[PDB]
């Protein structure tokens, strides 16, 4: 029984993610995704400026 407990604890030490870091990485990726789509929005308007030339 103790051996099966130690085995499951070791498999958990190998596979389990550290969720406390995952929350930070998740919200940081969300902020970077919103900044990326927003900067892409600014990127889209560059071609239209030349309409003033004509």
């Amino acid at each position: 029984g103790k051996l099966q407990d130690s085995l499951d604890a070791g498999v958990g030490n190998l596979v389990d993610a550290d969720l406390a870091k995952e929350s930070a990485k998740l919200q940081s990726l969300q902020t970077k995704q919103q900044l990326g789509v927003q900067a892409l929005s600014i990127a889209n308007q560059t071609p239209q400026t030349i309409l003033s030339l004509f």
Binding site: A9, G12, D16, D18, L19
Partner: protein, 54 residues
Amino acid sequence: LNSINTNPGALLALQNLNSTNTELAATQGRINTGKKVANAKDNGAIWSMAKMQS
């Protein structure tokens, strides 16, 4: 460290709880039987010796 899938400390507390449950059951057996060696499982040599002398 932080994880959902397993918490080793709960397993360790469960192991200590089962150990104290086993010692408690052994003490309760010494209570009802009235003897520190009432059967072969407790101590075979003293039990067989007392059985022959009885």
